[PDB]
Design an enzyme around this catalytic site. Structure first.
Site, mmCIF file in Angstrom:
data_model
loop_
_atom_site.group_PDB
_atom_site.id
_atom_site.type_symbol
_atom_site.label_atom_id
_atom_site.label_comp_id
_atom_site.label_asym_id
_atom_site.label_seq_id
_atom_site.Cartn_x
_atom_site.Cartn_y
_atom_site.Cartn_z
ATOM 1 N N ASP A 51 8.098 2.225 16.174
ATOM 2 C CA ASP A 51 6.817 1.623 16.490
ATOM 3 C C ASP A 51 6.243 2.411 17.666
ATOM 4 O O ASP A 51 6.798 3.435 18.066
ATOM 5 C CB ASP A 51 6.990 0.142 16.844
ATOM 6 C CG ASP A 51 5.660 -0.600 16.954
ATOM 7 O OD1 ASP A 51 5.616 -1.627 17.665
ATOM 8 O OD2 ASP A 51 4.660 -0.163 16.335
ATOM 9 N N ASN A 109 -4.946 8.218 -0.288
ATOM 10 C CA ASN A 109 -4.802 6.900 -0.896
ATOM 11 C C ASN A 109 -3.610 6.884 -1.856
ATOM 12 O O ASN A 109 -3.461 7.780 -2.685
ATOM 13 C CB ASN A 109 -6.086 6.500 -1.628
ATOM 14 C CG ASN A 109 -6.215 4.994 -1.798
ATOM 15 O OD1 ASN A 109 -5.344 4.345 -2.377
ATOM 16 N ND2 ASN A 109 -7.308 4.430 -1.292
ATOM 17 N N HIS A 165 -14.512 -1.801 3.562
ATOM 18 C CA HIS A 165 -13.212 -2.089 4.171
ATOM 19 C C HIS A 165 -13.237 -3.233 5.191
ATOM 20 O O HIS A 165 -14.301 -3.708 5.599
ATOM 21 C CB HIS A 165 -12.662 -0.835 4.865
ATOM 22 C CG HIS A 165 -12.180 0.223 3.920
ATOM 23 N ND1 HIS A 165 -13.034 1.030 3.204
ATOM 24 C CD2 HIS A 165 -10.926 0.588 3.563
ATOM 25 C CE1 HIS A 165 -12.332 1.845 2.441
ATOM 26 N NE2 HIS A 165 -11.049 1.601 2.639
ATOM 27 N N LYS A 186 -11.017 -1.197 10.542
ATOM 28 C CA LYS A 186 -10.953 0.240 10.283
ATOM 29 C C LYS A 186 -11.678 1.000 11.392
ATOM 30 O O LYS A 186 -12.811 0.672 11.737
ATOM 31 C CB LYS A 186 -11.589 0.577 8.936
ATOM 32 C CG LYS A 186 -10.770 1.540 8.098
ATOM 33 C CD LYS A 186 -11.662 2.486 7.321
ATOM 34 C CE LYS A 186 -10.868 3.335 6.337
ATOM 35 N NZ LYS A 186 -9.735 4.094 6.951
ATOM 36 N N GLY A 242 -11.293 7.900 4.382
ATOM 37 C CA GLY A 242 -10.820 9.222 4.011
ATOM 38 C C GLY A 242 -11.002 9.467 2.527
ATOM 39 O O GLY A 242 -11.407 10.556 2.112
HETATM 40 N N1 LIG Z 1 -3.350 6.599 2.481
HETATM 41 C C1 LIG Z 1 -3.345 5.294 2.202
HETATM 42 O O1 LIG Z 1 -3.085 4.740 0.907
HETATM 43 C C2 LIG Z 1 -3.600 4.451 3.267
HETATM 44 C C3 LIG Z 1 -3.844 4.847 4.532
HETATM 45 N N2 LIG Z 1 -4.060 4.033 5.593
HETATM 46 C C4 LIG Z 1 -4.271 4.639 6.925
HETATM 47 O O2 LIG Z 1 -3.074 4.405 7.730
HETATM 48 C C5 LIG Z 1 -3.457 4.155 9.121
HETATM 49 C C6 LIG Z 1 -3.015 2.771 9.555
HETATM 50 O O3 LIG Z 1 -3.036 1.605 8.597
HETATM 51 P P1 LIG Z 1 -3.145 0.169 9.258
HETATM 52 O O4 LIG Z 1 -1.887 -0.585 9.040
HETATM 53 O O5 LIG Z 1 -4.424 -0.478 8.869
HETATM 54 O O6 LIG Z 1 -3.231 0.533 10.824
HETATM 55 P P2 LIG Z 1 -2.891 -0.360 12.131
HETATM 56 O O7 LIG Z 1 -4.165 -0.643 12.833
HETATM 57 O O8 LIG Z 1 -2.059 -1.513 11.710
HETATM 58 O O9 LIG Z 1 -2.026 0.678 12.953
HETATM 59 C C7 LIG Z 1 -0.640 0.899 12.413
HETATM 60 C C8 LIG Z 1 0.555 0.948 13.335
HETATM 61 O O10 LIG Z 1 0.652 2.282 13.936
HETATM 62 C C9 LIG Z 1 0.995 2.132 15.301
HETATM 63 N N3 LIG Z 1 1.532 3.255 16.098
HETATM 64 C C10 LIG Z 1 0.584 3.853 16.857
HETATM 65 N N4 LIG Z 1 0.983 5.032 17.409
HETATM 66 C C11 LIG Z 1 2.253 5.061 17.029
HETATM 67 C C12 LIG Z 1 3.162 6.032 17.343
HETATM 68 N N5 LIG Z 1 2.849 7.102 18.070
HETATM 69 N N6 LIG Z 1 4.439 5.912 16.891
HETATM 70 C C13 LIG Z 1 4.646 4.910 16.004
HETATM 71 N N7 LIG Z 1 3.827 3.849 15.799
HETATM 72 C C14 LIG Z 1 2.584 4.023 16.276
HETATM 73 C C15 LIG Z 1 0.475 0.861 15.787
HETATM 74 O O11 LIG Z 1 0.768 0.317 17.061
HETATM 75 P P3 LIG Z 1 -0.398 -0.075 18.045
HETATM 76 O O12 LIG Z 1 -1.499 -0.606 17.193
HETATM 77 O O13 LIG Z 1 0.170 -1.099 18.954
HETATM 78 O O14 LIG Z 1 -0.775 1.184 18.746
HETATM 79 C C16 LIG Z 1 0.341 -0.032 14.562
HETATM 80 O O15 LIG Z 1 1.535 -0.791 14.590
HETATM 81 C C17 LIG Z 1 -4.954 4.426 9.166
HETATM 82 O O16 LIG Z 1 -5.230 5.783 9.415
HETATM 83 C C18 LIG Z 1 -5.376 4.007 7.758
HETATM 84 O O17 LIG Z 1 -6.655 4.506 7.416
HETATM 85 C C19 LIG Z 1 -4.055 2.682 5.449
HETATM 86 C C20 LIG Z 1 -3.817 2.168 4.162
HETATM 87 C C21 LIG Z 1 -3.599 3.092 3.139
HETATM 88 O O1 LIG Z 2 -6.936 0.128 5.251
HETATM 89 C C1 LIG Z 2 -7.490 1.372 5.415
HETATM 90 O O2 LIG Z 2 -7.899 1.743 6.669
HETATM 91 C C2 LIG Z 2 -7.612 2.248 4.312
HETATM 92 C C3 LIG Z 2 -7.196 1.903 2.984
HETATM 93 C C4 LIG Z 2 -7.362 2.821 1.920
HETATM 94 C C5 LIG Z 2 -7.930 4.094 2.141
HETATM 95 C C6 LIG Z 2 -8.357 4.459 3.442
HETATM 96 C C7 LIG Z 2 -8.929 5.682 3.721
HETATM 97 O O3 LIG Z 2 -9.110 6.600 2.727
HETATM 98 O O4 LIG Z 2 -9.319 5.992 4.985
HETATM 99 N N1 LIG Z 2 -8.198 3.532 4.529
#
Ligand SMILES: NC(=O)C1=CN([C@@H]2O[C@H](COP(=O)(O)OP(=O)(O)OC[C@H]3O[C@@H](n4cnc5c(N)ncnc54)[C@H](OP(=O)(O)O)[C@@H]3O)[C@@H](O)[C@H]2O)C=CC1
Ligand SMILES: O=C(O)c1cccc(C(=O)O)n1
Ligand SMILES: NC(=O)C1=CN([C@@H]2O[C@H](COP(=O)(O)OP(=O)(O)OC[C@H]3O[C@@H](n4cnc5c(N)ncnc54)[C@H](OP(=O)(O)O)[C@@H]3O)[C@@H](O)[C@H]2O)C=CC1
Ligand SMILES: NC(=O)C1=CN([C@@H]2O[C@H](COP(=O)(O)OP(=O)(O)OC[C@H]3O[C@@H](n4cnc5c(N)ncnc54)[C@H](OP(=O)(O)O)[C@@H]3O)[C@@H](O)[C@H]2O)C=CC1
Ligand SMILES: NC(=O)C1=CN([C@@H]2O[C@H](COP(=O)(O)OP(=O)(O)OC[C@H]3O[C@@H](n4cnc5c(N)ncnc54)[C@H](OP(=O)(O)O)[C@@H]3O)[C@@H](O)[C@H]2O)C=CC1
Ligand SMILES: O=C(O)c1cccc(C(=O)O)n1
Ligand SMILES: O=C(O)c1cccc(C(=O)O)n1
Ligand SMILES: O=C(O)c1cccc(C(=O)O)n1
Lengths: 245, 245, 245, 245
Positions: free
Chosen positions: C33, C104, C132, C136, C142
């Site tokens: 984390d 995604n 979204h 976000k 993205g």
């Molecule tokens: N490609 C895909 O299918 C998807 C991509 N995403 C992307 O994934 C990212 C996060 O998703 P989401 O759950 O909404 O985000 P969150 O807002 O829940 O952030 C996710 C976690 O990452 C943390 N974290 C921050 N920095 C670190 C670190 N250096 N080391 C380890 N843990 C860390 C957070 O802690 P804290 O908040 O306390 O800093 C938080 O617990 C975004 O960029 C989102 O767009 C999301 C869904 C799907």
């Molecule tokens: O929950 C999100 O932030 C999320 C979920 C799907 C795709 C993307 C993305 O393409 O940035 N971001």
């Protein structure tokens, strides 16, 4: 009833002309277009005119009409407070004449604005998506701007929409209309469409209106045309014409 | 306030349990499930119970609750006139006890039924499309059936929906609920969704509600739980507790 | 297979942790984390890590992982050419290690981008609407930016979208991604949704993807996790992992 | 090229007539309607005819056309295997003559069927919702039935859609087309619309086509008209003339 159409050559105008020509209780007295003298109206002894021209000329025609005591049902968008005020400071110096202006004559659209007003307070988020043909000059639509204003006015005491947007491309979050984001889509194959989105914990509410055909504006226009004399002066929107219907 | 949950193991039940456990002004006194004795309720001195079980048992539990003077907020669908009538009398012998039954606790859904009622008269056609998870036992949804009934009741004097259907595959036109066609979609990935469609000359109006998460029912449930004692007897729907008519 | 999760406390991270813990063929070796030492990974002898953190730290972790020869399945958005190039100029100096990055992991989303590419040439207009949750940080998504890029690349020889917009409020027409307008909606109650609109003479085509639950990303993630070693180096998107499935 | 229109008075027919009359490379040789002698075609030396009549007469006209060696582009729905088989032989006695039959000439619709085929295998559930004007005689639409068939054929080895429906009102779950539920909506203000829904764990995919105007069928029709002679015999669909497979 003698009725003339301002902008009889336009996408909407040609439809109104066809509609009035079909109305057994209405007589098409004038078919003005760009350039044609406003005197053609006084020639056919027109009593009511349907305006579907351009915001750059509305104010112009509105002066002429209000002068000769001719009633007006205006659909031309781009009506600002000052303009309304302009139209206001005119009817006074020539009452007995009626003028109705509406951002949308489609009943579904009017109902959409009605429901939007009622649902606003029950949700955390509210956004408006508007979609039109690629020939529209103004963005967002007059209806969208009006809907956004209504929503923002109903949520007076409530806090603004929650948004954690930190980084963003310019314009991605649409235009800001009194704190309500409005998105304008210009796509080929479309006519006039609007979507009002309300969101809260685990649920959303969507109120969508679709004008698949320009004939959808006819009923509202003719309704205002027939009952025009019922209300002297300016009205704004056709909500009063059917809040009891 | 001591609150017990009937069906604490269900998809919705587990959510209500979590919600009540988080409510600082509420005490989770009971967590009944299938089989568990209804006496567990009288054990924890429960005053209000949230029922999200099954239509085959509701009537059963409702008798017990109404007897021990325990208030009830029921979400379990499948409530027929006879059933409602039955519960009516059940309480007449034990007033001072309140019971609220609602086909949907999502605010957006309640608002949808509200708007549907208001728009029905302005359109020629009206149809309802309902979409739920593939675990739903009843089709169409209770809300859909109720919405269809409301629409059909608002168009009392008007003629029926126009339909030139001559040849058709069995069931293609959905179920008939008082002259209003209702379509039920069972798809994986969905939760609770409804779409009300109104159509007329060149335009349509769509009022859509989306329950993306089961937590969307919490606000409505807790609201009814807290103000339960406010209305003695039986209450159908959430409207009474809401500003709307 | 020992698997560790980077950002195990995040909205998506907590889901992946639960998923890996349930996978009978996978062992949750790490639950890092914010703050927790990257050494915890080397402690549990992790071989593959799921990254769902933040764009401000991805590059950081990616260096560590690629060093200790640990495979990486990254979901964290905000991946630019330079960054990809960065990740590129690293794997070289330490092959035998695999890294997969995807905008995604939802299959429907991947399919959406697939269909968008194929339909682009057949239409005059194309726009993207993305919606979204209000948490976000980046706008547009993205996926939206990637979809817009794909569309613009498929219409290479064709003229741009027709738009007669003369007057407009700032931002009403969304962000410009290679000539394709992209609109970003941030609403409460939503998760991850996208809509691709294509328009032409009298018709439109809509390809919509809806991520109602974050569990929708699990299948894609685990698929990439298991077959990670199959392809050395960087991949980008999970299209190669199922173009034949 | 001399082109005649069968059903020149119909909603679609009148559009095709207008289209052919505007085509600088095409000559409107015939404008047949209900009752008018099929000999009018042989009178104007027609080489290709556009058929948008009624399923009760198609087979009739198709015999005449195939006899006089006149090519045919048929849009009239209600084409069954037996009918197709019949026309097959009809031409075997008169090769050198071409006949093309398509359930939908809108490109977006053809693309929809194309994408539906490709996505079917990736999902657990699949359903089709079709919406048309209240003047349609058949339910469900020819396109809907064809789309459902394509989907069911792509999921050959996979199990059927999951459905826990125990109690239900007659017709609520739509018509069954090879195990794929199809829902038909007849609403005023609509033209031709279709929605294909695919569902799985926490996500859904929607492919929607909208024919807002009947002019949307023109491009496909004229395309088939010009390249008609390219393929001798019978051709079902527009796919062959398109880049797609
Ligand atoms: N490609 C895909 O299918 C998807 C991509 N995403 C992307 O994934 C990212 C996060 O998703 P989401 O759950 O909404 O985000 P969150 O807002 O829940 O952030 C996710 C976690 O990452 C943390 N974290 C921050 N920095 C670190 C670190 N250096 N080391 C380890 N843990 C860390 C957070 O802690 P804290 O908040 O306390 O800093 C938080 O617990 C975004 O960029 C989102 O767009 C999301 C869904 C799907
Ligand atoms: O929950 C999100 O932030 C999320 C979920 C799907 C795709 C993307 C993305 O393409 O940035 N971001
Ligand atoms: N309130 C409502 O329900 C609706 C409102 N509208 C609004 O109405 C307006 C036009 O609709 P639409 O048909 O799409 O527009 P068009 O682009 O078709 O323009 C309409 C007509 O007005 C013309 N005209 C211009 N100036 C004059 C003039 N001074 N005297 C008379 N004729 C003139 C045009 O000629 P030329 O182009 O040659 O200059 C054109 O024929 C817009 O503001 C639109 O937003 C549209 C639909 C509904
Ligand atoms: N009004 C509203 O806003 C809403 C209403 N509903 C309705 O509420 C009901 C619940 O749906 P959902 O929660 O998804 O379904 P689930 O089946 O997932 O939840 C039902 C729970 O009730 C159980 N149970 C069965 N009989 C008893 C009993 N006699 N005593 C206590 N527990 C019992 C179950 O056990 P087991 O499965 O082992 O039998 C199961 O744990 C349905 O009728 C649904 O239509 C749903 C959402 C909202
Ligand atoms: N494949 C495609 O892309 C499309 C297919 N269709 C299909 O094509 C057909 C047309 O629908 P639509 O145009 O809206 O319906 P309409 O009924 O409005 O058009 C039909 C026309 O055919 C007529 N006609 C009837 N029999 C004959 C005949 N034997 N000789 C010539 N004229 C005749 C009619 O006359 P009268 O009404 O007086 O009998 C009417 O003018 C339907 O089967 C429809 O499903 C429609 C759109 C697209
Ligand atoms: O509020 C508007 O600006 C509006 C409403 C309906 C149609 C049109 C249009 O066709 O330009 N514009
Ligand atoms: O009105 C209904 O029957 C209804 C409403 C919301 C959810 C459910 C459900 O999950 O079964 N059922
Ligand atoms: O596949 C069909 O049956 C179909 C497709 C488009 C329009 C119509 C119609 O207007 O009847 N019918």
């Amino acid at each position: 009833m003698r009725v003339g159409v301002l902008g009889a050559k336009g996408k909407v105008g040609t439809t109104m002309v066809r509609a009035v020509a079909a109305a057994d209780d209405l007589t098409l007295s004038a078919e003005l277009d760009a350039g044609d003298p406003l005197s053609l109206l006084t020639d056919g002894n027109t009593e009511v005119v349907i305006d579907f021209t351009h915001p750059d000329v509305v104010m112009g025609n509105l002066e002429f009409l209000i002068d000769n005591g001719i009633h007006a049902v205006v659909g031309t968008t781009g009506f600002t407070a000052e303009r309304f005020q302009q139209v206001e400071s005119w009817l006074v110096a020539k009452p007995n004449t009626s003028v109705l202006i509406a951002p949308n004559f489609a009943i579904g659209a009017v109902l959409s604005m009605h429901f939007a007003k009622q649902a606003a307070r029950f949700f955390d988020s509210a956004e408006v998506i508007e979609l039109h043909h690629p020939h529209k000059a103004d963005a967002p639509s007059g209806t969208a701007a009006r809907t956004a204003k209504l929503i923002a006015e109903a949520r007076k005491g409530l806090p603004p929409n929650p948004d954690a947007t930190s980084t963003s491309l310019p314009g991605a979050r649409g235009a800001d209309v009194d704190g309500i984001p409005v998105h304008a889509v210009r796509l080929a194959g479309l006519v006039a469409h609007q979507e009002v989105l309300f969101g809260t914990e685990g649920e959303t509410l969507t109120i969508r209106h679709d004008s698949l055909d320009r004939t959808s504006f006819v009923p509202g226009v003719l309704l205002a045309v027939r009952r025009i004399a019922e209300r002297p002066g300016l009205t704004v929107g056709l909500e009063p014409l059917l809040d009891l219907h």
